Design a protein around this ligand. Sequence first.
Ligand SMILES: COc1ccc(CC(=O)O)cc1-c1ccccc1
Ligand SMILES: [Zn+2]
Ligand SMILES: [Zn+2]
Length: 585
Amino acid sequence: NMDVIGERIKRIKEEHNSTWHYDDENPYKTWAYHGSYEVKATGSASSMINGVVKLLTKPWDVVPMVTQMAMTDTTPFGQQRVFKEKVDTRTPRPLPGTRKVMEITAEWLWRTLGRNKRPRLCTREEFTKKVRTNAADSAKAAVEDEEFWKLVDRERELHKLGKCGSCVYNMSRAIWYMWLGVRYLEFEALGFLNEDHWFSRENSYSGVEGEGLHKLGYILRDISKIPGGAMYADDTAGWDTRITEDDLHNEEKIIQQMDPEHRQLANAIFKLTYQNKVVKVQRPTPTGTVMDIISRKDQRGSGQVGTYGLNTFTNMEAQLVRQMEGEGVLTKADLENPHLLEKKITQWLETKGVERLKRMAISGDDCVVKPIDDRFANALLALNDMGKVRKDIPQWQPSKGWHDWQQVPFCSHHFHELIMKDGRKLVVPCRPQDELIGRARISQGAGWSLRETACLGKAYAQMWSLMYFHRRDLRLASNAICSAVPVHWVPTSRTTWSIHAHHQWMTTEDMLTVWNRVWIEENPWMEDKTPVTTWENVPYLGKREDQWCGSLIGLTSRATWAQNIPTAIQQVRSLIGNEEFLDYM
Ligand SMILES: COc1ccc(CC(=O)O)cc1-c1ccccc1
Ligand SMILES: [Zn+2]
Ligand SMILES: [Zn+2]
């Protein structure tokens, strides 16, 4: 294995020869450990609290989920704990018949996905524009430096020779340039999957890339109209650790559709940074803190460009295989058989494949499947054998599905159908309210001015106005935050890193105008384009649903907070200063 990874380790070893040593009491069991070198401590045990959001959400100061979110450990100790728990494991190799089905399905899926689109290389300009339209942080300075792009060209020439010298994944500027350059080369070779929307619903059938959170519920409601069994949404226990060498080799088949110059670079990303990988992980010792150099041939690097798309691909393939087992196409004897007949798999794929893909909503490891019947609930042989073991359930206990799409969990949410005062229907995203409030109360980093903190606060408030307006407490707290923050102050920093976030709340435009654009004008499931002229006509969940989903409506502490919220708004106002504020209450 040293012929592929040796150069990268040699360069780390050379760079850190001052403190480089082999810690013989290292905790790696399934990863090959190469050595250590001393580093400064990165991360924190707790998270900085957004005082603006906190002062305007007093009843949630006494809420356990809100307190838990205010924690989250990113120190070398925190990193080591998460590593041991999941990452340091081995997935048993799938059986020979399972490997054949996965190969037949992967080949058919890649051909289906590339029926209209052709792969292509992504550029320095695309990457620069992406970095720019995200921060405008030290990545923008690096992208502006010509010396970064020269290092990129040097690394690419090694990749063309089938070599890698600096592409290392992490769990002053020379080390940083090497990381961003690794991500650029990965983006250059595999970025087309995201950039050219290979996993859009129109292109992939099961996919939901570019749809946006506000569309996911409508998609789940459309799947519910398809005749079949219940809707299943099984969670995989640590999906990224379950990506096998067989999965990686199946994912690689995309290179067959590429032009020779693209194929050469994509093949280099697959063979050198995916199928072999060099990882840096911080670890505390009695002497201090060290950085460990580890390596392995399988699993997915969570912080990579191709991760989302390739997890989407493999999950689409895995669910088609589970659907085949459910229908009796794949038996236990077939999975164990190294000479398994290809015919019935190819026949099922060519005659039913696309119809079966349409029964699904797949976003990375998140899946919703509506099979032709409930035999799927007990079709677990191929699923477990592929290594996609369901989280917190005995291996062979049947899956529990849902007969109401509104109960189905997907992408950390569930979705409610609301009836507006004018009879029109809305399909809205929802989650336990404590998770929404707990997240908004967290500020990202330290040394942030009251202005920066208030603007992130405003971003969270406006996200609630657009997506979670149907939650009584969130519309009230959103109106309170927007009344306490100067009107002309632009929301800064992101509220989420989710692929489903389109960030329509990152504006000073009127939120009711934005609401109308998203939910009425641009909404394809809204036949009647009549605008809503008042927030009084923007619906809420039924009181009982709002309460079931965590609302404090009906409690005295909540009624007191609502009554006294202008006092809190005024206190935030007096601390911000003499600025232009607008009263949304
Ligand atoms: C499926 O969408 C999401 C999934 C998870 C999270 C949580 C997080 O990332 O902090 C947020 C969103 C989200 C929220 C509003 C608008 C669009 C996306
Ligand atoms: Zn490299
Ligand atoms: Zn809900």
